[PDB]
Symmetry: C5
Subunit: 257 residues, 5 copies
């Protein structure tokens, strides 16, 4: 595809606005947004997490006005939704010390988002190649010990919700030319969430040549992970807590050959 | 709808200067700026916080000089937290850091937030625990379901009353608020250390990318804030939220609209 | 006051250079730059700190060359905390980090603050606990009510005397101070770690958005500071505030004004 | 003498690859991990096993055969598999009773370099009496001065799984034809902060607009990404490393 | 000194490149780069540190090609700490973090400092404790009084000797050093985690706001550094300072002066 001129006029722009809910495991009917309590295996060889203990990537495919012209994603506004809910320290939490308030959600986090004109492309990497991933997840197949550092057989598309576990997959930096992605892993038991919200911040999606993601088939792909940390209940057991993510994307019509 | 030119001349500008006090719960007549001590439910199902244990959003609606079409447009903001040094009182019924130590300072989870708009801040409800029973005298997300733990679009509100909207169940609705500029930071964790900056040399510009600030409908300016600074730990170890007031200085100019 | 042109030439400019020593409480003749050990009250109603336990704002009023209308305009500031490496003394009566370890260094809650103005820094009172009884020899919010814990507009003052205005009672009043530029950071918590930078290559510009700095009424420059670096913990576990001096260098120029 | 840049569609090329970490690989299942760390009784008796010592990674990448030289102009790079560190259910020591496993945390070193020849190294030893093991390349004739600076300890990063991270740093007195960047974050309580994006580029050009020039049409990439330590249920700790992605843009440059 | 034009031509520039080794106390023949283990006095009065427990400032006087009038002018600096990876040795008689764990790395209070000037760094004495009794072989503030704990202007000195001036009682004098550029950071706390960046792509410009860098008196360039990285804790729990060398590359040009 050669990239030619942007179309102008009143009908040459459009806006997509939506939210992506987190997929943390949802271990029962009251615990949407949470994972199952985490259990620890006795040995590397016996690691076999249940499905409801594994946070997964979220993805949405948004149809665009039907249009060679293609919609070009130019700017993004994005925000984690419900940051203040993490101030509930009065609900079945373990106390920080005798007579203290409950521990807030804290510890290891992953905040990630992407915007593309096609599915986010994934590369599989495993903490422990002998981990037995559960049915209903899509995970790196034919794992070897090299899968612990880099096995290039582990290629996938983020093309399904509640399916691709966060811990097995990262964006593939060798692909994804038609996607812009951003993530931060902050690891450690003592990690303290720092969540900013504002309606004044914009990310520009144009590459160095001034071209944004081009939406194949008139579809925009949004992807997210917002694992905010772990919630600790009274017994000390811990579970992941996630939050929804807002996306506002501006697009314009671009001609290509 | 259609924004035209800015008016010039000495009479074309005005300023609003004020402070918003915090509403942390005020459990008795000596404890303004504090919540009630925090307790913990045995289960999610039994979570029923007291009114005086829940910090709320602060709001002020400020009448501007009558114009009539012209509208006041908010252009700049200076803001700061008032009384940061009071958190150096570590000798007033605090729990000692260790044997013979000084009192622990206010610390832990904090939320700092302010907004400026030409109409009420628009809110979206999100709950940590949908079975939380919110108390009488608060305005909270109604008909809560388990989906309210992540996103339930039913939960819409306006920040149009003080001591009413609990912080923990409401956030600025990013799908609305076209005519408002908002800024917030949640810093979460038991070991969070307050970092509070003060200066009179910093200004935030409120213009959007087309150079247009909030436009004040009916000649009203809306200021909103939350400054939960952390928790104060008393000698027994029980903890209560501590908040501080926020100063606002807004410059506005007349703008013609159709 | 209408502000007009800047004067130029050899002696259109002058420089002020000095240090402000900290006023931490100075509980005996060997403890300059420290407070008294902190003790904790049993209740809010019984909080009555002794004077030597309360750090105070430092201030100097520096007379400038008589001009008369012209006024001296404060244009740039260089500033630096003096003696930062003194805090590496971990061998002097401190409490060991663990068995056989070095002494704990000064750490924990800090307030670093400085201001330059053409008149006294203007203060607003805010109290952690309105029932606190402040001691004789200090200037503190009077007629305190429960509203003083958040905002009571009665508590207005000028930083016009040393060893007098306790840091915990007073902040710069953001509703005033048009003729002062102030800057401050409170970093609170037991686990706060001091981060102190020094360099002679950094300059802060004092001009406002119109290109006008502080204008020195009666030819006086007002410098104010607090540098509570944290707390020193001695062998017994008791803790006391430790502060350091602050260097100021201000360039000023002559400015013509009307009225 | 460096002269003009060549233009035309044949004048640019691109190198893209991953460097795997070399953490020690103590058994056939533990690629990316070191052996459990044990501690010597004295400085004099410090003698770590090979599989306990992370090493620098390096790849020499051949370029299209070309006086013209390939000039390295820009770099995109990130750590690959950052999310794998969210596995807190695999034989980890629990944070507290009934809690999740501790994540990888503690001392980290993240390092990358791009050059037109092998990275040049200077040796510095924590403890000069450390006996380094067979199969590593380490500062020879160590003296007590080697603990601060002994200029005899010079080497080229010209072999994988060989140069231990703790012995060697880039020689700042050399490396005129390499650009290097590294951060050591030290302490038991260090928490990994790992950013990924395909939108960030590092420019490799010096202050005269000249990037690394590839001698013999070879590009040298080097890395260390020791992310911290994993603690298993017994409390013993091993280094965990991750791979690093490199994409380098290059252009043809004439030289005399 | 009125400063005139810069010379040009091939011969008008020169470069100084070297390493300054740290002076941490070197308590025995095997422990170069370390201090003696730290012990604590029972009173301020009895504070008597041994010489080998006291890190000192490092300095090098580098003679430059003889010029005469012309002076060498220091224009740019590359600098970095050498050996940052040695701090990953957590297997050498360190105290375990916990049962069966690795040894604690170097951590805690640090001071990183460097300066370039055309004459000795000028120093001001400040004392944590004015009654500290500094040892023979060190150069320390004389006639200390209680005012020395905050500012006593009698305590002036030149950094004109190696392993002599202890770090803890001297800082750069901000009322002087017109002809030097200095940069330092103290990061204090038992829980300080060292963050050490290395790169050969960073340059510090030494020119002042008038475009004039340090002018080298008698054709001598003065380099100074302190890099106390933290403390090493051995198995017994005793702790000692650990330092590293610093690289300096300075570009200088000939400048005419009257």
């Amino acid at each position: 595809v050669e990239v030619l001129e942007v179309k102008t006029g009143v009908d040459s722009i459009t806006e997509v606005e939506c939210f992506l809910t987190p997929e943390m495991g949802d271990p029962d009917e009251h615990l949407r947004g949470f994972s199952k309590s985490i259990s620890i295996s006795d040995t590397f060889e016996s690691d076999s997490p249940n499905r409801d203990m594994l946070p997964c990537y979220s993805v949405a495919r948004i149809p665009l006005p039907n249009l060679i012209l293609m919609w070009e994603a130019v700017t993004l506004k994005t925000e984690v939704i419900g940051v203040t809910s993490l101030m509930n320290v009065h609900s079945n939490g373990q106390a920080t010390h005798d007579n203290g308030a409950g521990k807030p959600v804290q510890g290891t986090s992953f905040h990630f988002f992407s915007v593309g004109g096609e599915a986010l492309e994934l590369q599989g990497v495993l903490f422990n190649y002998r981990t037995k991933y559960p049915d209903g997840t899509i995970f790196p197949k034919n794992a070897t010990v090299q899968s612990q550092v880099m096995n290039t057989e582990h290629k996938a598309y983020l093309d399904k919700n509640k399916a691709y576990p966060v811990e097995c997959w990262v964006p593939d930096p060798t692909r994804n030319e038609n996607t812009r992605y951003f993530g931060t892993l902050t690891g450690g038991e003592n990690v303290m969430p720092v969540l900013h919200i504002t309606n004044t911040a914009t990310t520009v999606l144009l590459d160095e040549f001034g071209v944004g993601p081009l939406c194949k088939g008139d579809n925009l792909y949004l992807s997210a992970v917002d694992v905010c940390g772990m919630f600790t209940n009274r017994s000390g057991s811990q579970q992941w807590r996630g939050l929804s993510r807002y996306f506002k994307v501006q697009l314009r019509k671009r001609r290509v050959k």
